Assembly symmetry: C3
Homo-oligomer: 376 residues x 3
Amino acid sequence: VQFRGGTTAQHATFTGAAREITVDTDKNTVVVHDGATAGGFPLARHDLVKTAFIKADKSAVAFTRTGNATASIKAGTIVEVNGKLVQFTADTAITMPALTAGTDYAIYVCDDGTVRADSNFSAPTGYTSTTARKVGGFHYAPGSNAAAQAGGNTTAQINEYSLWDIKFRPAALDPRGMTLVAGAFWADIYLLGVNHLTDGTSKYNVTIADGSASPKKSTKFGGDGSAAYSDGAWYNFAEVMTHHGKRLPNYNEFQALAFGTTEATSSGGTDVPTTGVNGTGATSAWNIFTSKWGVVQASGCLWTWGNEFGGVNGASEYTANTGGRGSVYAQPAAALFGGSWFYTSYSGSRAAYWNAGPSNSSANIGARGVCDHLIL
Amino acid sequence: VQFRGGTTAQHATFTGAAREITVDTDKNTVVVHDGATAGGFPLARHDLVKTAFIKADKSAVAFTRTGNATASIKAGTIVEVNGKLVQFTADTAITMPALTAGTDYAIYVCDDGTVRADSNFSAPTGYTSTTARKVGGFHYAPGSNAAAQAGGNTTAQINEYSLWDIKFRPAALDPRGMTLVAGAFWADIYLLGVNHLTDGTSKYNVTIADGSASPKKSTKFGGDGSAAYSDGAWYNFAEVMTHHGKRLPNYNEFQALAFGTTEATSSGGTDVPTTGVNGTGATSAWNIFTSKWGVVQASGCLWTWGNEFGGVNGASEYTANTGGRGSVYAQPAAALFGGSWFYTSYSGSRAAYWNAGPSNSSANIGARGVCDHLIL
Amino acid sequence: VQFRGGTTAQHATFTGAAREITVDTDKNTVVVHDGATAGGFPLARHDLVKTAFIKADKSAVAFTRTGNATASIKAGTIVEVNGKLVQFTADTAITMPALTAGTDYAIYVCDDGTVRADSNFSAPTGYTSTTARKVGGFHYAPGSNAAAQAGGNTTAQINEYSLWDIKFRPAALDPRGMTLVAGAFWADIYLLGVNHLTDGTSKYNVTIADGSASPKKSTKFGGDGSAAYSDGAWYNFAEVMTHHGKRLPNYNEFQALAFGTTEATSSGGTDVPTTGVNGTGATSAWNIFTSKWGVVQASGCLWTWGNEFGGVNGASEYTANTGGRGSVYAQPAAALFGGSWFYTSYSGSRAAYWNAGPSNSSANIGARGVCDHLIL
Ligand SMILES: [Mg+2]
């Protein structure tokens, strides 16, 4: 059966019989007719809905945490994948791989109707980037989120607030290793690492970047991928954050992200070298400082540079202390938030120090990234 | 009539006759043929366009204010609802319910082709959440926006700048009670209430939150829904704003949002207890302070905490004044904007005070929320 | 051929034969049947996919710069235009018009399958707003982006970082004359002009706005389109930026946007009157100050007001210096970034001055706009 067909021009002045189907040969689509409307009602070609992703509640993430090691895709989720419509009319279990503490996972809706997680961010085991579509993901944290204000535990589990989907995600360039804070903005779960170029800013069990072990110099700002900044100036950390489409936190962002930590408590010991891992001779284990949202070492471990200025000022003269990128006049301090290991009861979700110029560097100052929450 | 049909695999190597229609039984969709392209041209299933919402001008809101109590949906608006395509090829009147001063309304496009407003945010009277689709809304304000710089009147009317649609809206968690300022960002029409958990941050005719009547403690930050913060510290107000996905305003945001108010004028009297209502013994009625954008009590009523730091500093020693969440060192002031009732000619769209630490509290300091503008 | 058809109600309880097609007369669409599913599988009408725009990589711009005067649309780009599906399965050359230094261009995907640039932002030469769809654009800069930290050249060329598409763009009200900085945020290529109302904030070869030649007063804030602000206060510049949905830069934004400029170098001479053009008696040509991202006169030409406060404070008394919009108490300085022509080695990507109150005005202080990066 071949249908009556013509060009778009020919259709413009054609009115088919009621419930007649013609073919627009310019478009290669069907045109439905009502016996009244000239040009009829052309139908959409599938390619035009490619990548469609529809949720029942667009103001929440597409997935529900159902247990420490389990999660589900929500009822009402419709997904375009490999030319097919794949949907879920009930909360449907996500098929899990073996989960390892401190690893990010990607969630795929597959063209066979399954939904599955995997550590591979291209395609899940047994599928291709064609048969499996990445719709979101999560972080499998080394410990629980804080239930109150005494930090969390060390039972590896899905951090519910790290659940993201393609329409409910960090505005950062990459969504991995972030958690949603009060539904308002995303925070890096872990402090900035030295190897942020290959690891991203937020990674479990890596060397923390500070004054003594400066982060790798940004390849977007003349770095080569091997060189590190010569110190831990605010300037350098802010630059690394920008590389990744993130910011250093505001005061309001810091207090929100760090809530849940054990207040007025510090790591103790002599150092905090590694993310998600006890400090050197620490009197408090790392988990003492997990926030409500799953931000690891949220306070009392390393100060973070903040994105705020004020407090004590530098000299009222042109001082060339910017790494050779100009001079500053009456430069106010750049905020430091959280406290560090040496700071006993001074540390906490609101610990703030405003007596260090942005050109300052030390072994107990690093950084944490934040970014905007995107709902699409 | 049953058409030739096969699986997706079978179609991959099949080329139908020109203007032949086959059925892909794996997809359950039509495949159009051109007698040349192997696999033909599969058509989109309706479920894949579910929630589609298309506007002629994506850089403006979907509705036009046509009068004090009337509004229209714009020509060129196409809406998916209950499986149907519903569209408007001309500016079409929105069917209104009875409107009450200081109430938010939701706009629904219904599957019978009508568009209507309602105070119910689930479904409008006579419809269900299935037959009626919420596409946006507005605030019916207690008075007009400022025509110049002398505030507004007390004639209840639609605030044109409070018009929002699902693709032109506050980034806040909930869009209600906000107004779009210079097309740049959204501002809470009303000052933060004590009962922001059940009312949202911006509600007409409610008790204002300040140092003496602190807001309810955020349920996202260990609050139970009954307890209030023990004082009106910047810390507490910033926290409440975050709860709702909002911020305290910047200096640039404040001057923009408050423009239109009567400058160098204060409420007078002894207090401002209630939003959108005269202050206690006020010498100026509330409407004296409506901004160009419809921000109520924009200036001269209560100071708002700002999201900016600087000015006079606290001691250069570790001071534990954060509500038990750490210590601050050389803590600069948190900005206060707008002036309050006692401040005569000092109040205005640029009134700014930088001599109060974020741990300060008083009966004339509250907060106003802002957030980013979202165009999708 | 007229098909069996009925209303949506009638379909709800109808199960057609496998691979039968019926017509829903309420919807005017086809319903496919499987001989099992009551109501069958209704297909999408084309109008519901109107404006669809699909890219292979949603995290990058839709176009590639292929040379100084050439560019391509990327493989995998699917575009809805004038009822047709138009797509590109390989990187496809964009048809160029004659290009002029310092001009913005719009990219259209046309219903004949072509993709072309044009200086007209409504429709390209030989097409209409119906037959041609605007999907993005770019800036054809007066010179190259900085390869290192010695600025750029004067060979007119496409600035690769100024490439934007409808789903990868500034959050600003208008996308023109902006460049994407480290993939993180957008910066105005040029300093704010006096005639920003008709030119936008960022335009080549126009009079720069400063203390002596204040910008036009914003029509969104009581301006008439002819009047200028009486001086170059921070207040006025911040206001102009808001008009356009932009901000003055943060410190972190400024250092990012200006990287690539010749550091510790100033324009010299006695003035910088015009964007993208040598200063008056300048010892360094304008191109000495082009950033890595193509920000023109990024440093050492005119200070920009920043969106940050701190440093030296005004008096601890209520000072009415806000242009008659209230009083300020202990007002900290508003940041100035970049240096200017007189400032020799003090200028650079990190040059910052914190000793000028927001009410200050001078011939060497202007502004540059930034905004958020939008990925949709
Ligand atoms: Mg500040």
